[PDB]
C-alpha cells in the first residue's frame with residue numbers, strides 16, 4: 402500500500 | 411420518445 | 420416566470436401538494452423475483468415522478484428538450500432520495516413499499532445490490548440523525564431535479580429558481596428557531612448529502628446497465644430509455 | 651486542535667498548504683498519440699497525487715484522524731481533488747484545460763483519447779461556472795478541503811462527529827469570507843448553496859472519470875499508486 406507509506410512519513 | 415409523451419400530457 | 424413571484428411559504432405548499440403517492444409492490448425471494456418486484460415498482464414510480472416534475476415551480480417554464488434532459492440526468496437520484504425518505508422511521512431497513520420493507524441481507528439476493536443498499540441505509544441514518552423535515556426534503560428533491568443536469572448538454576432561469584429554493588430552505592430554518600450560524604451550517608450539511616446521493620445514483624446506474632446486459636429480467640421501455648441516457 | 655482556529659487562520663492554513671503547479675514533460679514535437687497523451691496525463695496525475703497526500707496532511711482536522719480513515723477519505727476524493735484543482739487552474743483560460751503551464755488543451759485534443767471528450771466538456775463547463783461565479787482562491791481551498799472530508803464520511807464511530815465539526819467550521823469560514831466581500835446574508839446563503847452544488851457535479855465527473863480510467867486499465871500505462879487508488883473504487 403503506497404498511499405499508506407506516503408501518509409506515514 | 412416515451413418521456414416526451416408523459417411530459418406532453 | 421411565476422415561480423420567482425412565489426413566497427417561501429407558497430413555495431413549500433406548492434412542493435408539498437405536488438408530492439407523489441406511496442405505491443405498493445405486487446403480491447422468500449430469488450434474484451429474478453426480487454428484481455421483478457423492484458423493476459415493476461420503479462417503473463410505476465417513474466410515471467408519478469414525471470407528473471411531479473411538472474408541478475415543481477419553474478420546471479414548466481423550461482422547454483421540452485430541457486425538461487427531458489433534467490429528468491434523464493436526475494431520475495435515479497430522485498427515486499433514491501424518495502426511498503431514503505420513506506425509510507427514515509425504519510432504521511436498518513429500506514421501505515421500498517409499505518408491503519415491501521427490506522434489510523441488507525435481503526439485498527444480497529441480487530448480485531451487487533448490497534453495496535448500493537448500504538449506501539442507501541447510510542443516507543437514511545444521516546437524515547434521521549439530522550432530523551430532516553418534510554419541508555426540507557421536498558426542497559432537496561426539487562433542487563436535485565434542477566441542479567443535477569444543469570451543467571451538461573435558460574440556465575439563468577434555473578439558477579434563479581435554485582436560488583429561490585435556497586431562500587425557501589433558509590426561511591424554513593429561521594422558523595424553527597435556528598440561529599444564524601446554525602442556519603447556514605445546516606444548509607451546508609443538507610446540500611453535501613446531495614453529493615453522496617449523486618454518487619449512489621452513478622453506482623446504481625452501473626448496477627442496472629449490467630442487469631440489462633445479464634438479461635436476467637426484462638426492464639421497462641421507459642426504464643430502458645432513462646438508462647440509455649446515461650451512456 | 652483545528653477546532654480552535656479562527657476563520658482567517660483557517661484560510662491562511664489552507665492557502666499556505668496549497669500544492670505547487672507541476673510541469674508536464676510535454677514535447678511540442680510529437681503531435682498526439684493516444685498512448686502518449688495518456689502517458690503525459692498519467693505521469694502528471696501521479697506526481698500530483700504525491701503532493702495531494704502531503705497536502706491532505708495539512709488540512710485542519712485531517713491529522714487528528716486515524717489511518718484507515720485518512721486512507722479512506724483520500725481513496726474516495728482523490729480524483730475529485732485533482733479535478734477541482736485542474737478546473738481552478740483553467741479559470742483564466744476559456745475553452746481550455748490547463749493540465750500544466752506547458753500543457754493547455756481544448757476539447758478537440760481531448761478527442762485523442764477514446765471517450766475522454768465527454769469528461770473534458772464537463773471539466774470545461776465547471777471552469778466556465780467558476781469564472782461566471784468569479785470563484786475566489788479563499789473559496790477554492792475551502793471547497794477542496796470540504797471535498798476531502800465529506801466525500802467519504804457516508805461510507806464508513808465518533809469520528810464522523812469530529813469531521814462534521816470541522817466541516818461546520820469550513821462552512822463558517824466561507825460565510826465569513828462572503829460577509830467580508832459585502833454580500834448580505836441572502837447572497838451569502840445563495841452563494842454558499844451555489845458553491846456546494848458544484849461539488850455534486852464534481853462528484854459526477856469523478857465517478858465518470860473513475861469508470862474511464864478502469865477502462866484504459868483493461869485496454870493497456872498507469873502508475874502503481876494510481877492503480878492502487880483505482881482499485882479502491884474497484885471497477
Ligand SMILES: O=S1(=O)C=C(c2ccc(O)cc2Cl)C(c2ccc(O)cc2Cl)=C1
Nearest residue numbers: 457458460461464498499502535536623
Ligand atoms: O437498490 S437500488 O439502487 C433501488 C432501486 C429502486 C427500485 C425501486 C424504486 O421504487 C426505487 C428504487 Cl430507488 C433499484 C432498482 C432496481 C431495479 C430496477 O429495475 C430499478 C431500480 Cl431503480 C435498485
Ligand SMILES: O=S1(=O)C=C(c2ccc(O)cc2Cl)C(c2ccc(O)cc2Cl)=C1
Nearest residue numbers: 691692694695698732733736769770859
Ligand atoms: O481528463 S481527465 O478527467 C483529467 C485527468 C487528470 C490528469 C492529470 C491531472 O493532473 C489531473 C487530472 Cl484531473 C485525467 C487523467 C488522465 C490519465 C490518468 O492516468 C489520470 C487522470 Cl486523473 C483524466
